[PDB]
Design a protein around this ligand. Structure first.
Ligand SMILES: CC(=O)N[C@H]1[C@@H](OP(=O)(O)OP(=O)(O)OC[C@H]2O[C@@H](n3ccc(=O)[nH]c3=O)[C@H](O)[C@@H]2O)O[C@H](CO)[C@@H](O)[C@@H]1O
Ligand SMILES: [Mn+2]
Lengths: 107, 500
């Protein structure tokens, strides 16, 4: 059971939008919901992201997939993005699945 | 008056016990149904087990680590060993851990709890290898906290099984505690059935069946209500998340403005209950732990447990309303405990004052009937005939639990003579009081009347009770002589203790 942040690396100009998808793979358990964490370059601390502002996260339950649409990228948005998957239901453990992470460079 | 009181006592106790019985059976049925749909070779959850010990017996520690390694769970991230030692004597525990697991052991000078940086990266750098910590003797919580940090350190850790140094575990026990909550996300903690294996002494034997009952009835019942008031030290599961969420609060528990350096069990569980999370208990997970065999050590242990219970009841009630509908049973249970203690004390006071032989005969008979019913249930549940030894639990309960209760209540607020007094003077005064009541009653009723039907009934009842207790003692003695009452695990434990 693994989670794949398909676009795991990317470099893009400021003042565009970027979409990062998070898919839970090889799981018989249905995805519950997805949490997104951000680490600033150099920094190690992880900061949680919430729906609103420039952050728009879409959650798909049938495909056990989620995606974060971060729009209007500035320079300080440059960092590693991590998705944190959840499984729930009857007999389905509440698990943290951490994806490979997506390092974004904004120039 | 006396007849009404005994009647209500009997009906009340039996009704609550039957309700707890059906609740626990429903809990067991739900757990079995949940397990029935478990996929085979299920290892979805990554678990980092945590050990905490101090001055443990080297042989028992070696057996505990052997059991931990022998567990069949295939998704154990690492073993975190924490020992508040930093002392030449405690190096024996480190040597024992080295002969079983990876030789590497780290001995930080500083305690993470008192550290300005509570992240374990100061003391640890690699998460793949199993790590043992030697730290200055702080006590309990702290040690656990250390482990907690080290656990959380590894992200994979989705849960943390907390095990006492002196605990024998089962290969399955792990999955058995790290799976129940799969069924219900809310479940944030799984109490694991623990069993007293040392049963040579009658006390140990009694306590063993006591444990049995407790775990498989009350715990079970509360488990059904997804609100087990307390987790299991020896065998206890905890979602890493809720842990991280309660570790610090629990690591910083001060009662009346005083870091509670007592039973941690209860406080973190009470914090989890405050969060509104559901706690379930499973009986399929078993962990063998030893029990006190000396009456004085049992007294002090039960006194400490009573102190922790009385200290945690206020917060338990204060947080019980947060469970909405649920929790009502928890409130009923604690109210039952307090009112049951008060009723027992009042009944004994009334018996001592009145000294009516018919009354004492009636209470003895009904208490024997209650213990008979309880032991019959326990034997039917365990498919084992030694559960009938529980009928003697009335003696040990009366002579130990009550003095421990009074000691805790008196010592909650406000050379060696004093300290020794604070432990056993309550118990000695209680024993003197019961003896004085007995002799006063026996002299107040120093008469014989064979023409009185009530007197005849009382005499035949007391004689029957005496012969029953005598034959139970005799069968226990012959069982001890033939070593039949020994637990199955104790036999090979003795075998490889001798072969050492
Ligand atoms: O429980 P049990 O009834 O097994 O015996 P103890 O209460 O002595 O053991 C409690 C457990 O907590 C640990 N422990 C011991 C002493 C102490 O001051 N603090 C502490 O946390 C020990 O490693 C032990 O395994
Ligand atoms: Mn021990």
């Amino acid at each position: 059971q693994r989670v794949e942040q398909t676009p795991t690396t990317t470099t893009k100009e400021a003042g565009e939008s970027l979409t990062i998808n998070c898919v839970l793979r090889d799981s018989a358990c249905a995805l519950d919901n997805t949490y997104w964490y951000f680490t600033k370059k150099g920094a190690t601390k992880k900061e949680s992201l919430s729906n609103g502002g420039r952050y728009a996260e879409t959650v798909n339950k049938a495909s056990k997939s989620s995606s974060l649409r971060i729009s209007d990228l500035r320079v300080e948005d440059s960092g590693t993005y991590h998705c944190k998957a959840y499984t729930a239901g009857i007999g389905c453990w509440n698990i943290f699945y951490e994806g490979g992470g997506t390092i974004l460079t904004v120039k | 008056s006396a007849v009404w009181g005994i009647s209500v006592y009997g009906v009340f106790v039996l009704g609550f016990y039957i309700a707890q019985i059906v609740f626990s059976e429903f809990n067991r049925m739900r757990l079995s149904d949940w397990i029935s749909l478990r996929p085979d070779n299920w290892n979805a959850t990554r678990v980092a087990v945590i050990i905490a010990g101090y001055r443990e017996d080297p042989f028992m520690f070696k057996k505990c680590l052997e059991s931990v390694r022998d567990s069949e769970y295939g998704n154990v991230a690492r073993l975190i060993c924490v020992i508040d030692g930093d002392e030449e004597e405690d190096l024996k525990m480190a040597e024992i851990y080295k002969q079983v697991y990876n030789d590497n052991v780290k001995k930080p000078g500083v305690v993470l709890c008192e550290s300005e940086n509570k992240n374990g990266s100061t003391i640890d750098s690699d998460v793949s290898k199993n790590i043992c910590i030697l730290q200055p003797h702080r006590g309990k919580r702290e040690s656990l906290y250390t482990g907690f940090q080290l656990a959380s350190m590894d992200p994979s850790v989705h849960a943390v099984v907390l095990i006492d140094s002196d605990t024998v575990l089962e290969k399955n026990a792990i999955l058995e505690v790290v799976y129940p909550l799969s069924c219900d996300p809310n479940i944030k903690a799984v109490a694991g059935e623990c069993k007293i294996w040392n049963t040579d002494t009658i006390l140990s034997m009694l306590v063993s069946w006591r444990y049995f009952s407790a775990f498989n009835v009350e715990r079970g019942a509360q488990s059904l209500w997804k609100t087990v008031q307390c987790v299991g030290g020896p065998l206890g599961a905890y979602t890493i998340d809720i842990i991280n969420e309660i570790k610090d609060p629990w690591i910083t528990q001060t009662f009346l403005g005083n870091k509670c350096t007592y039973g941690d069990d209860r406080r973190l569980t009470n914090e989890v209950l405050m969060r509104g999370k559901k706690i379930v208990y499973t009986p399929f997970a078993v962990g063998w732990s030893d029990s006190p065999t000396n009456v004085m050590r049992y007294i002090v242990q039960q006194t400490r447990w009573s102190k922790s219970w009385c200290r945690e009841i206020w917060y338990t009630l204060g947080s019980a309303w947060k469970h909405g509908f649920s929790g009502i049973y928890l409130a009923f249970e604690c109210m039952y405990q307090i009112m049951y203690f008060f009723l027992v004390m009042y009944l004994f006071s009334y018996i001592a004052i009145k000294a009516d032989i018919r009354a004492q005969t009636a209470t003895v008979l009904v208490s024997t009937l209650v213990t008979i019913i309880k032991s019959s249930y326990l034997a039917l549940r365990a498919k084992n005939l030694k559960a009938f030894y529980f009928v003697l639990y009335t003696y040990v309960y009366f002579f130990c639990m009550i003095p421990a209760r009074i000691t805790a209540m008196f010592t909650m607020f406000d050379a060696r003579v004093w300290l020794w007094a604070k432990q056993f003077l309550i118990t000695y005064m209680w024993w003197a009081g019961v003896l004085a009541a007995g002799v006063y009653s026996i002299v107040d009723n120093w008469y014989f009347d064979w023409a009185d039907i009530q007197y005849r009934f009382a005499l035949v009842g007391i004689c029957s009770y005496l012969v029953f207790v005598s034959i139970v003692l005799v069968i226990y003695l012959i069982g001890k002589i033939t070593t039949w009452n020994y637990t199955p695990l104790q036999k090979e434990l003795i075998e490889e203790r001798y072969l050492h």
